[PDB]
Structure formats: C-alpha cells, structure tokens
PDB file of C-alpha atoms and ligand atoms in Angstrom:
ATOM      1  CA  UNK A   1       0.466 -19.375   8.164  1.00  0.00           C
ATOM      2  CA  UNK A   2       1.101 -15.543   8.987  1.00  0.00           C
ATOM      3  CA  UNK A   3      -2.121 -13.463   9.474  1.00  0.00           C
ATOM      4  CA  UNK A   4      -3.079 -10.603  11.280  1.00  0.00           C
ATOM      5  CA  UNK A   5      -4.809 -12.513  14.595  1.00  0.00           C
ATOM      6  CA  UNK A   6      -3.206 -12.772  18.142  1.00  0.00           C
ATOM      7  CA  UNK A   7      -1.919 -16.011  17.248  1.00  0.00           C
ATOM      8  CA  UNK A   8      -0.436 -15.258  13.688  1.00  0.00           C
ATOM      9  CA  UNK A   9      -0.272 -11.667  13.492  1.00  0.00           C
ATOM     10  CA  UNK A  10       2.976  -9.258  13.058  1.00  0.00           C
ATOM     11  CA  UNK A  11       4.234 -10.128  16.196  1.00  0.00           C
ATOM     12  CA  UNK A  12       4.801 -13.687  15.735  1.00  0.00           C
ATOM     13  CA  UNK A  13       5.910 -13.098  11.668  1.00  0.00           C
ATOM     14  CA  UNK A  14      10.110 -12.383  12.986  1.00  0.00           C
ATOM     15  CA  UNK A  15       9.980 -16.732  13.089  1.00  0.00           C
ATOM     16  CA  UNK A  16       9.379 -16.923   9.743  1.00  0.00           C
ATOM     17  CA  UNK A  17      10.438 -13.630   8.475  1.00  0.00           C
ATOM     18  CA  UNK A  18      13.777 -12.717  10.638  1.00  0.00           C
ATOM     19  CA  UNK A  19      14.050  -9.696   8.422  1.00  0.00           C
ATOM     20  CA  UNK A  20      10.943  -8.664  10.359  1.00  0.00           C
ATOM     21  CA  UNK A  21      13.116  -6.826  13.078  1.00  0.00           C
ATOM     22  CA  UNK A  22      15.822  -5.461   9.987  1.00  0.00           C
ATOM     23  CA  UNK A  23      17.267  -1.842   9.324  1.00  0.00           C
ATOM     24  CA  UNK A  24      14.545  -0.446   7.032  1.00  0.00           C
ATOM     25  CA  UNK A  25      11.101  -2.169   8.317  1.00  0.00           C
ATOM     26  CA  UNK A  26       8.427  -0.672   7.121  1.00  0.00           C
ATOM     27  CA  UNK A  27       5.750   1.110   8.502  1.00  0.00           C
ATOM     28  CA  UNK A  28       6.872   4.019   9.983  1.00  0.00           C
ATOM     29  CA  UNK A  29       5.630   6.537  12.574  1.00  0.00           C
ATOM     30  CA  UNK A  30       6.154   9.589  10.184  1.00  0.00           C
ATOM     31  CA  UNK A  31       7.436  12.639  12.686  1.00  0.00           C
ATOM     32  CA  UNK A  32       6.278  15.938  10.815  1.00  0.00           C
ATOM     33  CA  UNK A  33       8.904  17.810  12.824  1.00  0.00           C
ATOM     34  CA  UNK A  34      11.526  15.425  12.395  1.00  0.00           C
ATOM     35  CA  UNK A  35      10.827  15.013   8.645  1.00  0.00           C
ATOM     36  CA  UNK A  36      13.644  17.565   6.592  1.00  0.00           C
ATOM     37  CA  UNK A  37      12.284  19.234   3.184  1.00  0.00           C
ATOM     38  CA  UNK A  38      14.801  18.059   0.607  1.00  0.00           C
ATOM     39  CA  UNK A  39      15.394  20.652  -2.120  1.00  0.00           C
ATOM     40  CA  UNK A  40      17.263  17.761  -4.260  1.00  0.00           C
ATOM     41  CA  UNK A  41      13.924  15.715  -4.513  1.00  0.00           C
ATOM     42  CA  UNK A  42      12.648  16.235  -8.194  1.00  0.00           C
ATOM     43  CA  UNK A  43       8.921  16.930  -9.481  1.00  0.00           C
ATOM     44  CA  UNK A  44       7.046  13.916  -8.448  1.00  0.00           C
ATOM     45  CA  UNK A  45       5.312  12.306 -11.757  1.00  0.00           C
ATOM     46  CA  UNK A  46       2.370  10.224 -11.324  1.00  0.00           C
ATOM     47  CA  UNK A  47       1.823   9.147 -15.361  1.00  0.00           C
ATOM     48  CA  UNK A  48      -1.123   7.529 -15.000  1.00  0.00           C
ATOM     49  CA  UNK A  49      -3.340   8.235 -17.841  1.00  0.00           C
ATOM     50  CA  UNK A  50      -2.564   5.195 -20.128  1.00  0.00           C
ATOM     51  CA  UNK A  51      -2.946   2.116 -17.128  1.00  0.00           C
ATOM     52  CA  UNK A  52      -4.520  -1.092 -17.960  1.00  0.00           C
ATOM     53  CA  UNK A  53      -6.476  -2.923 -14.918  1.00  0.00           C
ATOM     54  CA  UNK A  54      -7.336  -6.139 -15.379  1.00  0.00           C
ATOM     55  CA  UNK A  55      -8.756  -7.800 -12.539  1.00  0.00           C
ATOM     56  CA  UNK A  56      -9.298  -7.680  -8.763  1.00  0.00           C
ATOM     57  CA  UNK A  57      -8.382 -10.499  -6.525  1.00  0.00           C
ATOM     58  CA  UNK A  58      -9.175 -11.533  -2.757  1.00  0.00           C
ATOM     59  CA  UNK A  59      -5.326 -13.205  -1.700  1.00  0.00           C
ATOM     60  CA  UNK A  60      -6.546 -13.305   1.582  1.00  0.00           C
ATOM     61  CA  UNK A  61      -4.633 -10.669   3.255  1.00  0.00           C
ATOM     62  CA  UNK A  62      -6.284  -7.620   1.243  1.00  0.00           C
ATOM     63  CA  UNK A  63      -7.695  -7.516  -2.315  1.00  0.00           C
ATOM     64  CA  UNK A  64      -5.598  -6.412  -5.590  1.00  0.00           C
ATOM     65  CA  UNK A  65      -6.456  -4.209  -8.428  1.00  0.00           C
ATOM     66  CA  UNK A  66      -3.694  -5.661 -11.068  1.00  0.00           C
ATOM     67  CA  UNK A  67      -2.778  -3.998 -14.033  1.00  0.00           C
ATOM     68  CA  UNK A  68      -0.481  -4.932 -17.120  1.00  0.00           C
ATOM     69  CA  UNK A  69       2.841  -3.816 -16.733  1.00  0.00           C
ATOM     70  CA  UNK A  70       4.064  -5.302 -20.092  1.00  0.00           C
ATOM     71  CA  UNK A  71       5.011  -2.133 -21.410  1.00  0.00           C
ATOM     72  CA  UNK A  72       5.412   1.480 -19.777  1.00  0.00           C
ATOM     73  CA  UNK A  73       1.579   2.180 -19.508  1.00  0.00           C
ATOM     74  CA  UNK A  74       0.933   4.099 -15.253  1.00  0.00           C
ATOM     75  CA  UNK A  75       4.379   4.838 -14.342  1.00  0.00           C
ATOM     76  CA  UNK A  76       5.769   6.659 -11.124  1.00  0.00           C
ATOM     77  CA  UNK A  77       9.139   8.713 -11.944  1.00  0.00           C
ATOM     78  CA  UNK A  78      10.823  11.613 -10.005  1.00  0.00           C
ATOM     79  CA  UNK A  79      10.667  12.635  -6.314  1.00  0.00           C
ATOM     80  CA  UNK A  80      13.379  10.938  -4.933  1.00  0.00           C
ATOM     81  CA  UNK A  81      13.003   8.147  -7.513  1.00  0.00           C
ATOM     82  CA  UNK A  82      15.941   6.938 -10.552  1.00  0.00           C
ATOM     83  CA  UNK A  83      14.293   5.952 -13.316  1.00  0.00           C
ATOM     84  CA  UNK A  84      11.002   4.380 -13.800  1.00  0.00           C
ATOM     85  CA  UNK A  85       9.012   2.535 -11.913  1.00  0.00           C
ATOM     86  CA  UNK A  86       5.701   0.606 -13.306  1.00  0.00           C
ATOM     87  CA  UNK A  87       2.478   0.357 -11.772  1.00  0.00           C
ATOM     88  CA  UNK A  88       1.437  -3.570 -10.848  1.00  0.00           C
ATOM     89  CA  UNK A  89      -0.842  -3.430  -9.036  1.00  0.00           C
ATOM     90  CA  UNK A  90      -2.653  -1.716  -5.951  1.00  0.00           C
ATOM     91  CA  UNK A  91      -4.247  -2.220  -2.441  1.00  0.00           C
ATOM     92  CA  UNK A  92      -5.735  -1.220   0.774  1.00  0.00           C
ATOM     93  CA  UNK A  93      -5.192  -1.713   4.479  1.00  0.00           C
ATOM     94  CA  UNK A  94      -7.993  -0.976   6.498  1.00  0.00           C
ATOM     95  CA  UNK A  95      -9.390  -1.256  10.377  1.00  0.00           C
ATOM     96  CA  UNK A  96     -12.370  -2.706  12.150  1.00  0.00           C
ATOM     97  CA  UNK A  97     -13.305   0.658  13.137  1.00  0.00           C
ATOM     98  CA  UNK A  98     -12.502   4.349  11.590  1.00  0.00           C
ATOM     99  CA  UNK A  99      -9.623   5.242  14.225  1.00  0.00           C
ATOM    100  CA  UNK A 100      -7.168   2.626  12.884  1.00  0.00           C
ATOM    101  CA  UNK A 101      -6.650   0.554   9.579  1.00  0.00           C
ATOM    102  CA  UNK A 102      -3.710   2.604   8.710  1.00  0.00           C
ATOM    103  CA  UNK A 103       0.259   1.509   8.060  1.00  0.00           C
ATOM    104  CA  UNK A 104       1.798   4.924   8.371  1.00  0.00           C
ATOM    105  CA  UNK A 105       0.947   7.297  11.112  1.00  0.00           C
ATOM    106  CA  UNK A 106       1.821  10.569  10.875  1.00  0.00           C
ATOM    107  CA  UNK A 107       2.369  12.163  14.148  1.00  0.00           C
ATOM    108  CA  UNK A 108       1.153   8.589  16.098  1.00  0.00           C
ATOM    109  CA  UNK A 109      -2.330   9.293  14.177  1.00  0.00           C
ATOM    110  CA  UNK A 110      -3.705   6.281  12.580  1.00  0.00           C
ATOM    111  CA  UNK A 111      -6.202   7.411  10.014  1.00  0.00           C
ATOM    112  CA  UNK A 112      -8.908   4.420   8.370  1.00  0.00           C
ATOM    113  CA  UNK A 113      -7.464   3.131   5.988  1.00  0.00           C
ATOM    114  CA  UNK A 114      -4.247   3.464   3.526  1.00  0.00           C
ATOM    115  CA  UNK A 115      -3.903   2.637  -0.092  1.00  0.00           C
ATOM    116  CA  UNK A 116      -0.505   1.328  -1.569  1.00  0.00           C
ATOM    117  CA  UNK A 117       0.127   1.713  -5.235  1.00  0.00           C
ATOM    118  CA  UNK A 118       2.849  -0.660  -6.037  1.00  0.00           C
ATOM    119  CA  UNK A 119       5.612   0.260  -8.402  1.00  0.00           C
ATOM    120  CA  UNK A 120       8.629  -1.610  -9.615  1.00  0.00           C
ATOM    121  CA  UNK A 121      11.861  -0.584 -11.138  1.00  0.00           C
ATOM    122  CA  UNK A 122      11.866  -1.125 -14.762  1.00  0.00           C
ATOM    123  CA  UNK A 123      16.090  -1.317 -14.833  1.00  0.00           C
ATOM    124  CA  UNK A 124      15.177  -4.952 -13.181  1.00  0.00           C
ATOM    125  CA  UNK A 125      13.078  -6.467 -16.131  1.00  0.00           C
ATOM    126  CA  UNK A 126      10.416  -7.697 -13.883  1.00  0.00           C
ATOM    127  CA  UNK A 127       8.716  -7.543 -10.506  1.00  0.00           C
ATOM    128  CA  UNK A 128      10.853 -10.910  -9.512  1.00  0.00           C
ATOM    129  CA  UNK A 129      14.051  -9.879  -9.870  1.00  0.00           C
ATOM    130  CA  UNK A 130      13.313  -6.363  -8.090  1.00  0.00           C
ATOM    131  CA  UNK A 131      12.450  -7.250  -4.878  1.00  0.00           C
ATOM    132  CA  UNK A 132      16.099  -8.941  -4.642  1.00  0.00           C
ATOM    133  CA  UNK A 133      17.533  -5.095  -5.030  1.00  0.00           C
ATOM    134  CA  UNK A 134      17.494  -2.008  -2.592  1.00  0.00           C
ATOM    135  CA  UNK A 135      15.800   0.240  -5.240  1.00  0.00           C
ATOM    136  CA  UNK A 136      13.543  -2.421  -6.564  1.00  0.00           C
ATOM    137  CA  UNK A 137       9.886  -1.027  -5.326  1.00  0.00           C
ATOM    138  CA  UNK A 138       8.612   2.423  -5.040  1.00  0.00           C
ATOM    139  CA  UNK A 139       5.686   2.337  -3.482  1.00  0.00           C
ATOM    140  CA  UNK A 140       2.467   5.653  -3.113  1.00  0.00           C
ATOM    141  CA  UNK A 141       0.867   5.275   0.025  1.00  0.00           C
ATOM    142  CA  UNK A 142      -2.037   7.351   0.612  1.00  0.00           C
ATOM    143  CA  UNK A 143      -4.233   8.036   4.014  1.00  0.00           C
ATOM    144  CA  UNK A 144      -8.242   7.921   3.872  1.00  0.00           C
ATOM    145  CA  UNK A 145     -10.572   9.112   6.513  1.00  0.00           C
ATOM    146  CA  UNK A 146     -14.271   8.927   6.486  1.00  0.00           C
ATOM    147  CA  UNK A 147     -15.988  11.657   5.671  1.00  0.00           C
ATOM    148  CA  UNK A 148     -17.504  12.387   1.731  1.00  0.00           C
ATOM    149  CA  UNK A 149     -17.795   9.575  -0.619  1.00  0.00           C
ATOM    150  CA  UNK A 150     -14.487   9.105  -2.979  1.00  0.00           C
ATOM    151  CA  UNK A 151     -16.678   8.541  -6.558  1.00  0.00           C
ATOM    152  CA  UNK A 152     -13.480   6.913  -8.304  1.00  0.00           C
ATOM    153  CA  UNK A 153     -13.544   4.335  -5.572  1.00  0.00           C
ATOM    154  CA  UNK A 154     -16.941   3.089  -6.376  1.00  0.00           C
ATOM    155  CA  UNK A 155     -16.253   0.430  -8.652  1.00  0.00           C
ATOM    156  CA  UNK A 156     -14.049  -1.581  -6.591  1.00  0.00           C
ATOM    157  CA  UNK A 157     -16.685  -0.992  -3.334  1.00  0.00           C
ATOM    158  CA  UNK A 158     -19.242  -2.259  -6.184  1.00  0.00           C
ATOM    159  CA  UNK A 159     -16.996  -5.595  -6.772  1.00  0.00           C
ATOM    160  CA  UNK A 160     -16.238  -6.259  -3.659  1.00  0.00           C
ATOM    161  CA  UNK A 161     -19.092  -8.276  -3.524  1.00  0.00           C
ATOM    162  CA  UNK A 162     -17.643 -10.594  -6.135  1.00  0.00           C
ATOM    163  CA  UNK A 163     -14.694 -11.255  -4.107  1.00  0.00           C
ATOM    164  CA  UNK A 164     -15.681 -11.883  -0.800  1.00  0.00           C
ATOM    165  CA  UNK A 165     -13.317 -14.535   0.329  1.00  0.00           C
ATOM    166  CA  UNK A 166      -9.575 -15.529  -0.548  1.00  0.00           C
ATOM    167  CA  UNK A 167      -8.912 -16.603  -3.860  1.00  0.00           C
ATOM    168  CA  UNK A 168     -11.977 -14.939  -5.698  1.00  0.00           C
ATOM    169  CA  UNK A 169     -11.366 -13.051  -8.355  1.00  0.00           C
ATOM    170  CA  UNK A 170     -13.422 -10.926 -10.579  1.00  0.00           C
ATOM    171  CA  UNK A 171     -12.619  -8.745 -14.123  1.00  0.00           C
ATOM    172  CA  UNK A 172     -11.545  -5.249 -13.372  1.00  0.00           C
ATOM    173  CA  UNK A 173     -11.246  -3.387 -16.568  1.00  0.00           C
ATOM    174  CA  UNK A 174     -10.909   0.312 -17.716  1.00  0.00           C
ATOM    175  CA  UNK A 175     -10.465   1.402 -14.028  1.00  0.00           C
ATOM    176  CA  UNK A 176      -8.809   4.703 -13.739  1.00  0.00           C
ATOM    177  CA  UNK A 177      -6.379   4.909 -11.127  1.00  0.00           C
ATOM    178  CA  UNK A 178      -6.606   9.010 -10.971  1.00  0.00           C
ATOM    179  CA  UNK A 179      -9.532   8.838  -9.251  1.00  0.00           C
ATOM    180  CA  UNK A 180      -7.902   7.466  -6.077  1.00  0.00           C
ATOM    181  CA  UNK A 181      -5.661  10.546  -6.061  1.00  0.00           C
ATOM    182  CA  UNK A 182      -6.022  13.645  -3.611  1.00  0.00           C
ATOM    183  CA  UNK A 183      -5.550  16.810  -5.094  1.00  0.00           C
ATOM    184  CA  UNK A 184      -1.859  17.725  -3.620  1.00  0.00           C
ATOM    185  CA  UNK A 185       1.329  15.412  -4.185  1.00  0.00           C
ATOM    186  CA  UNK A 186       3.440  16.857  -1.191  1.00  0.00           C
ATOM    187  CA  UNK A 187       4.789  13.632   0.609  1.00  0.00           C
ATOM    188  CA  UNK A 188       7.623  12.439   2.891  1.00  0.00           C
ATOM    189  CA  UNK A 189       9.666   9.440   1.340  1.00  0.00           C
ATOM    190  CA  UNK A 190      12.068   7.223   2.857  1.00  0.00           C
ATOM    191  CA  UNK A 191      13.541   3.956   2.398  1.00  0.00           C
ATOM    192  CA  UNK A 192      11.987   0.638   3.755  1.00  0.00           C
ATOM    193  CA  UNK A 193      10.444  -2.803   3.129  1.00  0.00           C
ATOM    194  CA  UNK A 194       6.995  -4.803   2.378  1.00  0.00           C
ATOM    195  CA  UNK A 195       4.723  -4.311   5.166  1.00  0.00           C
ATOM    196  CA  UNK A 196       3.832  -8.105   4.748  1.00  0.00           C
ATOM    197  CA  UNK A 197       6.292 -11.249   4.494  1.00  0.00           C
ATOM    198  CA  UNK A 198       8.637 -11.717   3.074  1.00  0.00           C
ATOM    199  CA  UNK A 199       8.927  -8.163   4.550  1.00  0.00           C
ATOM    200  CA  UNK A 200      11.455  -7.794   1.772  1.00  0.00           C
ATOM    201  CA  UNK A 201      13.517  -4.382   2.004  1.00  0.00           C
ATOM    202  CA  UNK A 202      13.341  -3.315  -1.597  1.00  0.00           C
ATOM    203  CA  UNK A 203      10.920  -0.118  -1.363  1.00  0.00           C
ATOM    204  CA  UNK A 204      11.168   3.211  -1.639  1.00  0.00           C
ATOM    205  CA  UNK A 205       8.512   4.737  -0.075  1.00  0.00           C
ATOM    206  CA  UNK A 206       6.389   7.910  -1.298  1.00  0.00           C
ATOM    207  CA  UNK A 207       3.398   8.735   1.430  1.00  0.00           C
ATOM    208  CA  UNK A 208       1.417  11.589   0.735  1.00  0.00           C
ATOM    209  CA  UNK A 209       0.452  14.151   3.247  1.00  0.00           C
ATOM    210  CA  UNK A 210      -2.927  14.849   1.852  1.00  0.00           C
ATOM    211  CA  UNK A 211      -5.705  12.116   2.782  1.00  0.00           C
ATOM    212  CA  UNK A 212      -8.396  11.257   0.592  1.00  0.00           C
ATOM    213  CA  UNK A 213     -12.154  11.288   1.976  1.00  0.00           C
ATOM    214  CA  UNK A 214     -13.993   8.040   1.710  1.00  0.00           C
ATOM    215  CA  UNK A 215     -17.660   7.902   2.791  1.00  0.00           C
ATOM    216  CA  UNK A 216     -18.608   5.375   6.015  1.00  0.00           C
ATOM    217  CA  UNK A 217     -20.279   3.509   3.719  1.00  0.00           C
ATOM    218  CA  UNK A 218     -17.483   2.731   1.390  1.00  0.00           C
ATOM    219  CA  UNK A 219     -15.248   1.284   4.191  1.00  0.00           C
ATOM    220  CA  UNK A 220     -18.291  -0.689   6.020  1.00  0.00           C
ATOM    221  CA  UNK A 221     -18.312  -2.684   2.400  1.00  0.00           C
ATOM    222  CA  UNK A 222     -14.348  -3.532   2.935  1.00  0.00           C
ATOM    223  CA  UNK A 223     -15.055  -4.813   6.148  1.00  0.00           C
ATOM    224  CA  UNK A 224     -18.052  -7.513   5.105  1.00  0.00           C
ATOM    225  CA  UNK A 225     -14.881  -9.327   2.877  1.00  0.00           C
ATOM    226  CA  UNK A 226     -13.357 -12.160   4.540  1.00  0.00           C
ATOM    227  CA  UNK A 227      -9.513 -13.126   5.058  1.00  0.00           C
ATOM    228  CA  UNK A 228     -10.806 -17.192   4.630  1.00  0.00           C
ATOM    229  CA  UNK A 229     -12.025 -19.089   1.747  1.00  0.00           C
ATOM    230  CA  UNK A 230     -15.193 -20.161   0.647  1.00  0.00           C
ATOM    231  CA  UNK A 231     -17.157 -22.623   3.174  1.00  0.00           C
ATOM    232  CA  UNK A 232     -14.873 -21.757   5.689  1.00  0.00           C
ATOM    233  CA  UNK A 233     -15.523 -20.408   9.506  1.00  0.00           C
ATOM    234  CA  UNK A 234     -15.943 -16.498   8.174  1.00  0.00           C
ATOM    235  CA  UNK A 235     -13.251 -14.599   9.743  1.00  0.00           C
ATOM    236  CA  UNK A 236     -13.958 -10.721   8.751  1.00  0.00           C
ATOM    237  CA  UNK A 237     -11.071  -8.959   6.726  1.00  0.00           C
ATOM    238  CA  UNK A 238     -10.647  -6.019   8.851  1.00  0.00           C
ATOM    239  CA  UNK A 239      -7.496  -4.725  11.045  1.00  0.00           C
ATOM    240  CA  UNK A 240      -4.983  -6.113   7.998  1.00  0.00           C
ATOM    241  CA  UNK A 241      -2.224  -3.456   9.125  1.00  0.00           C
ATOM    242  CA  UNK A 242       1.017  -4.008  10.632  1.00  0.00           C
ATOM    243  CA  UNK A 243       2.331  -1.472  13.185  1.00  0.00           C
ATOM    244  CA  UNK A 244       4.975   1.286  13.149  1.00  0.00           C
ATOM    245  CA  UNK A 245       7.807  -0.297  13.425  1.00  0.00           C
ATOM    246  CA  UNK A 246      11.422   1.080  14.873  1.00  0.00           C
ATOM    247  CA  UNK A 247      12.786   4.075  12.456  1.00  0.00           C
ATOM    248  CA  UNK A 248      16.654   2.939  13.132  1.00  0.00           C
ATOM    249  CA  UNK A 249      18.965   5.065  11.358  1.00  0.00           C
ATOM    250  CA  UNK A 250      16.359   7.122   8.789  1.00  0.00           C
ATOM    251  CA  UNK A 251      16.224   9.772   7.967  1.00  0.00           C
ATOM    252  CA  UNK A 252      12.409  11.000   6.805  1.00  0.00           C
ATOM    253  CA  UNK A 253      12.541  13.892   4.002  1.00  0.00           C
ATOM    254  CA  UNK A 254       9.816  16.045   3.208  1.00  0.00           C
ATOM    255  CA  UNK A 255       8.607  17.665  -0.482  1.00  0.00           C
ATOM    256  CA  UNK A 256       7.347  20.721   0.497  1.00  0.00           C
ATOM    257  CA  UNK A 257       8.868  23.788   2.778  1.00  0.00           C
TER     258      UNK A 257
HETATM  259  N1  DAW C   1       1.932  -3.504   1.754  1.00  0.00           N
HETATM  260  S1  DAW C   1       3.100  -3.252   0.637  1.00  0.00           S
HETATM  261  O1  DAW C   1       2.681  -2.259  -0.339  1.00  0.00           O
HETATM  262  O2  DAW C   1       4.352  -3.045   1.314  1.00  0.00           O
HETATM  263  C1  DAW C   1       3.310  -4.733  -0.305  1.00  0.00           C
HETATM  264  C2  DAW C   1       3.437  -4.658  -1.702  1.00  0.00           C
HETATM  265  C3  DAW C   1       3.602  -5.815  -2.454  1.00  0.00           C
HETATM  266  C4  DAW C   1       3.642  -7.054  -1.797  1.00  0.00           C
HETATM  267  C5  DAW C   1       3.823  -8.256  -2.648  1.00  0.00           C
HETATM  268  O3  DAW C   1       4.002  -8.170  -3.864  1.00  0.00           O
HETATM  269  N2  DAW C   1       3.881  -9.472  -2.028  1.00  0.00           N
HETATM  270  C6  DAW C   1       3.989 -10.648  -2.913  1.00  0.00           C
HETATM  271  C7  DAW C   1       5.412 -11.037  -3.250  1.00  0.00           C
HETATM  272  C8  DAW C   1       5.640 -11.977  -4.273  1.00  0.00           C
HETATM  273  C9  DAW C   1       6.962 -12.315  -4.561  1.00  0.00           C
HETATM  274  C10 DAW C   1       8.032 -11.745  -3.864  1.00  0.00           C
HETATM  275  C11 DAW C   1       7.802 -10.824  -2.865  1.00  0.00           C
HETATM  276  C12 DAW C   1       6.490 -10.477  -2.566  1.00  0.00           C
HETATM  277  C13 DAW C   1       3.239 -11.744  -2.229  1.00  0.00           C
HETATM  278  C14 DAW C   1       3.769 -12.873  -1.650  1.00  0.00           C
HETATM  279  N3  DAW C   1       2.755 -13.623  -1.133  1.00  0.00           N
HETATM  280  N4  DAW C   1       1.622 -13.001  -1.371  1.00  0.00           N
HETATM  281  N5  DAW C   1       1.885 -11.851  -2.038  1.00  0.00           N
HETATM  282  C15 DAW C   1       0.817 -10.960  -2.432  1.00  0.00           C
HETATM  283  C16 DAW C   1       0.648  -9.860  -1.398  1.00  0.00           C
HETATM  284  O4  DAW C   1       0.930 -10.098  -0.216  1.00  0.00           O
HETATM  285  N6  DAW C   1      -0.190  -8.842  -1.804  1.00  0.00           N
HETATM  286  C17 DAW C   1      -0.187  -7.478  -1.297  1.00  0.00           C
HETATM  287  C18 DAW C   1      -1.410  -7.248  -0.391  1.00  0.00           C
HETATM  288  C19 DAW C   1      -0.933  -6.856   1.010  1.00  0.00           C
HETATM  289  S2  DAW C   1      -2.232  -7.060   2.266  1.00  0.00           S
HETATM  290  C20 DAW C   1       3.516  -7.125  -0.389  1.00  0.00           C
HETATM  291  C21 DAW C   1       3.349  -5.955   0.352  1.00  0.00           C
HETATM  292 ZN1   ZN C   2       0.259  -2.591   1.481  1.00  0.00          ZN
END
C-alpha cells in the first residue's frame, strides 16, 4: 500500500510504519559544517573485485542489482564499520527532473539521483536476522548529477528496458560494481534506518562526498520504468525518494580534515 504519491507517499507511511517518526530515521540533511572529522574512523575498504551479480529486478519501488552473498565475495569493512559487511544487493533513487531524486542532501542540496549499495553484517548469518540488530546494515550511498556519461552504468540503463514494470526481472551477470564508484572515498557516516518501510533502524550509513556524473540520457531511461505492473494504468517510476528527515540526537562525522 505505501508508495511515493500524495495519497501513499512518506507522509502517510508513520500509520503503518510508527518507527517512521523514530530516533535514527534516515535520510538526513548532511550539514558540512556541523559534520566533525573523526580521527578514530579507520581506512574505508570497498573489496569489490570478486562480486557476483545475478540479476536485476523491478519491485516496484526502484530496481535491484542482486548479487550472491553466499560467501565473502564484494565486502565493505573499515570506516566506522566492525567487521564485515557483504554486498546484497544495490539501487537507485531518482527524481522526475535533475534538481531532486536524491535521499541525502548535503547542505539542503538535492542532487539527481543517489545510489545505495546495501551491505549486511556477516556476525548475523544472514540479511534476516540483521535488520533485527543496531549494527545490522551498512549501507554506501553515493550522489549523481548530470553531466558526462558514467560508462560502468551502461548495462543496467541497457536492461532497463527488460524491466519496465514491477515484478520483471532480467539476468544481470558479470557486472562490476567498481564502475559505479567516484574516484575519492571521503564520506560522512552516521547511524540511521531504511529509507523505505519497514523503515527498520539497523544501518550504518557511509555517504560519500564525491558525486558521480551520469549523462541526461542515462537518467531520462530510469524515468520511462514504471512503479505498476504489467497491463496496468502506467504510473512513471520517478520521484522514489523520501525526504530529510529530523537529525535528533546525531551526531554526523566526517573522513577527511
Ligand atoms: N533505501 S535503503 O538503502 O535504505 C534500503 C535498503 C534495503 C531495503 C530492503 O532490503 N527492504 C526489504 C526488506 C526485507 C526484509 C526486511 C527488511 C527489509 C524489502 C521489504 N519489502 N520490499 N523490500 C525490498 C526493497 O524495498 N528494496 C530496496 C529498494 C528501495 S526503493 C530497503 C531500503
Ligand atoms: Zn535506497
């Protein structure tokens, strides 16, 4: 029933979701000057060389690239994270025009889009069973604007096709996550929840300060999917963002001076 309409949208998801208006709801409005550089934060390791995609899915909120997390394959450890967290599966949020689509703001700017790489804690044996603990989720958010064309995006623009409406799904192999990567890791982290219900708060979250550039073209194919299913009224799958919600008592930290 939730969505992101004026009838179903993050406004009306506290009636289902109470947690909605918790501590640690996430997005956040990221304040640069606010944000403190943390000298205990570790090296941030993205270990990404040996993932596995397997297929991309239209759920009807956003599409998925999933990946096999059987075994420690793309893994996220350091920054402020314990232990290791494994890659599942990742995602974008996106607007119906280039001045919004984003989660995160940094400074009240909304950039296009945002992509969430989702990451759960190994020391919980599965996905499941982390999102019932405070450190379950670590997930890399990252910031595109339009401008140049991001080449390691193509393939999933080229899919997209595939999947236009919720519950398609398509074979995703031998996609390389690296290429969705800007070249600087500096981020702020702090800790929060699922942007979507159940809005669980399970996540720690790593944003990084350097956007990627995607080309106009690239974000005019996400907006032709659709949030309904096949032979239904098409409702087009843009403006799938929730708001920045209310910081409470965070505290932002920064990885760079
Ligand atoms: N935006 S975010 O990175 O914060 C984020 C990350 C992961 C999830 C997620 O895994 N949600 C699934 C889930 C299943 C079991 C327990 C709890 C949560 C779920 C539940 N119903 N549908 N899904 C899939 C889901 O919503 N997909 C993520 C695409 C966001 S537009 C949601 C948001
Ligand atoms: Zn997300």
């Amino acid at each position: 029933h939730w969505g992101y309409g004026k009838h179903n949208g993050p406004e009306h998801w506290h009636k289902d979701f109470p947690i909605a208006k918790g501590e640690r709801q996430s997005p956040v409005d990221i304040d640069t000057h606010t944000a403190k550089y943390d000298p205990s934060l570790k090296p941030l390791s993205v270990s990404y060389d040996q993932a596995t995609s397997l297929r991309i899915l239209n759920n009807g909120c956003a599409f998925n690239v999933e990946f096999d997390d059987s075994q420690d394959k793309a893994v996220l450890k350091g920054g402020p994270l314990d232990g290791t967290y494994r890659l599942i599966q990742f995602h974008f949020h996106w607007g119906s025009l280039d001045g919004q689509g984003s989660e995160h703001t940094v400074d009240k700017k909304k950039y296009a889009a945002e992509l969430h790489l989702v990451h759960w804690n190994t020391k919980y044996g599965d996905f499941g069973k982390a999102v019932q603990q405070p450190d379950g989720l670590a997930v890399l958010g990252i910031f595109l604007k339009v401008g140049s064309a991001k080449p390691g995006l193509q393939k999933v623009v080229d899919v997209l096709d595939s999947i236009k409406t919720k519950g398609k799904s398509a074979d995703f192999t031998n996609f390389d996550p690296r290429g969705l990567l800007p070249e600087s890791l500096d981020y702020w982290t702090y800790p929060g929840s699922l942007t979507t219900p159940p809005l669980l708060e399970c996540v720690t979250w790593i944003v990084l300060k350097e956007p990627i550039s995607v080309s106009s073209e690239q974000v005019l194919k996400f907006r032709k999917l659709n949030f309904n299913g096949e032979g239904e009224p098409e409702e087009l799958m843009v403006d799938n963002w929730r708001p920045a919600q209310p910081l409470k008592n965070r505290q932002i930290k920064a990885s760079f001076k």
